Design a protein around this nucleic acid. Structure first.
Ligand SMILES: Nc1nc2c(ncn2[C@@H]2O[C@H](COP(=O)(O)OP(=O)(O)NP(=O)(O)O)[C@@H](O)[C@H]2O)c(=O)[nH]1
Ligand SMILES: *C(=O)[C@@H](N)Cc1ccccc1
Ligand SMILES: [Mg+2]
Ligand SMILES: [Mg+2]
Length: 405
RNA sequence: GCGGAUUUAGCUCAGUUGGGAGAGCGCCAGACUGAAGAUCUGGAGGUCCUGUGUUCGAUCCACAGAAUUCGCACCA
């Protein structure tokens, strides 16, 4: 609504993950401040600006994910700050599902904790290809060995879910202090402040280590719904990160999945951080106004694609790995009939597992392969990765292996 | 997104503290009546919405789903 969006740098999606309270949000606001200083039109955001709905303000925790914008000389970023409370992993999964890189925050005072693990694995099952780590709360600790240790562990954990933990950038700092500092004074620039300067380190890491992706602007348009709004005067808006291809007002699209029949609409609006875009392309975290669809007809988990470009599914073979009790998983085998939840991108749907012949019960830590029959149809594709969570926990990580129906 | 309710027989609802359900209508047999409705004797009918945890055992508890509802949040 307030301005037009003008491409002048490359665009990259990022965000925050880590164990509950390790400082994801503080650091988020601290990034806004600092960037704002050397780049004018970066609107800054305070904590309250981010954790703003009341329970969030009350309980003092992040519950909904938040989108914030910010840039550096090199690039322009959409940053998703996620909740670290285990009760809220679906939100987090949804945000991580839009990152091109994820900033994994680990409180140096606490070391790696559970969602530290979880988030890392979930990020992965959701497509996150790079992680930069920010060891926060440093101000609170000085034994270097304890710092140095937390690093190892973090790296090693990364290795486990196979992120090049050996090469992953690991920035140490206090986000609280940076923020605080920008509070005293907004205009601090690099070199002026210690604490602030670590954020420049983060900012650099992000600029440097997370490559800007290749974008298949040519393939058919595909954008996974992350959220939905009802906007004043205009209508029904669907927000998400463009998978591939593109859109501009006037194009008609398809709302696919999570429902009997798929449905058509013409996109009547395209924004990016509340700013008009002529045409959004693969990588844009956009918002789309859709001709006459109610909030009921559009929802997170469905997908926007080139009409006819896509098939929603239900059954499929899949190669899976069940997590150890130890890795935060189940501690009892399961059999056919088990119906946990499947997470593919911003989608999460319940499915009945069917063990192939020769397999009766799958145990924690195995690598099985089986069939699933989803309770709702959804945009699948072989090689598509996913997460299996059930009863409050992540129980497996697999990948589509063949589409049954 | 969050959070509460609710889901039990063909229908509508009661139970419950884990040993596993019960009534009104609705059906049926026998009685009565030409028959029907009322009455009277019996009789049949439920994966207790679903998965998992716990447990010797889960309708019930815990944790997770669905569907319906109702609050609240978010706001390209
Ligand atoms: N000493 C110190 N305390 C800090 C630092 N950052 C945060 N704290 C405090 O740590 C708490 C957690 O802050 P927060 O940023 O909400 O964390 P989060 O990681 O978003 N948590 P959630 O998991 O709920 O979303 C807040 O009190 C924050 O101010 C830091 O760098 N140093
Ligand atoms: C609209 O702002 C999007 N392009 C950015 C966004 C903001 C809020 C929620 C989701 C996406
Ligand atoms: Mg927070
Ligand atoms: Mg229950």
């Amino acid at each position: 609504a307030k301005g037009e969006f003008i491409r002048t740098k490359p665009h990259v999606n990022v965000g925050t993950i880590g164990h509950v309270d390790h400082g994801k949000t503080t650091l988020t606001a601290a990034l806004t401040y600092v960037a704002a200083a050397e780049n004018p039109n970066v609107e800054v955001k305070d904590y309250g600006d981010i954790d703003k709905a009341p329970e969030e303000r009350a309980r003092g925790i992040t519950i909904n994910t938040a989108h914030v914008e910010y840039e550096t000389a090199k690039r322009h970023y959409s940053h998703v700050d996620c909740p670290g409370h285990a009760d809220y992993i679906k939100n987090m999964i949804t945000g991580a599902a839009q990152m091109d890189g994820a900033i994994l925050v680990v409180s140096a005072a606490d070391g790696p904790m559970p969602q530290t693990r979880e988030h890392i694995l979930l990020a992965r099952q959701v497509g996150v290809p790079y992680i930069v780590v920010f060891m926060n709360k440093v101000d609170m600790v000085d034994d270097p060995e304890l710092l140095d240790l937390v690093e190892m562990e973090v790296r090693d954990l990364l290795n486990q879910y196979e992120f090049p933990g050996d090469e992953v950038p690991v920035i140490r700092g206090s986000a609280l202090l940076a923020l605080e500092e920008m509070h005293k004074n907004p205009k601090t620039k690099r070199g002026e402040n210690e604490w602030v300067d670590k954020i420049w380190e983060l900012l650099d890491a992000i600029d440097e280590y997370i490559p800007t992706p290749v974008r298949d602007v040519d393939k058919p348009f595909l954008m996974p719904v992350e959220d939905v709004f009802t906007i004043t005067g205009r209508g029904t808006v669907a927000t998400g990160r463009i998978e591939r291809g593109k859109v501009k007002v006037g194009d008609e699209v398809e709302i696919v999945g999570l429902a009997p029949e798929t449905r058509k609409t013409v996109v009547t609006g395209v924004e990016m951080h509340r700013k008009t875009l002529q045409e959004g392309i693969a990588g844009d975290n956009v918002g789309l106004l859709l001709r006459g669809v109610s909030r009921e007809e559009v929802e997170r988990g469905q997908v926007l694609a080139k009409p006819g470009s896509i098939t929603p599914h239900t059954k499929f073979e899949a190669s899976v790995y069940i997590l150890k009790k130890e890795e935060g998983g189940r501690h009892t085998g399961f059999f056919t009939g088990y119906r946990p939840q499947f997470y593919f991108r911003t989608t999460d749907v319940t499915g009945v597992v069917r063990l192939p012949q020769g397999v009766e019960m799958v145990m924690p830590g195995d690598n099985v392969t089986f069939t699933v029959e989803l309770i709702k149809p959804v945009a699948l594709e072989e090689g598509l990765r996913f997460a299996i969570r059930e009863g409050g926990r992540t129980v497996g990580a697999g990948v589509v292996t063949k589409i049954l129906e």
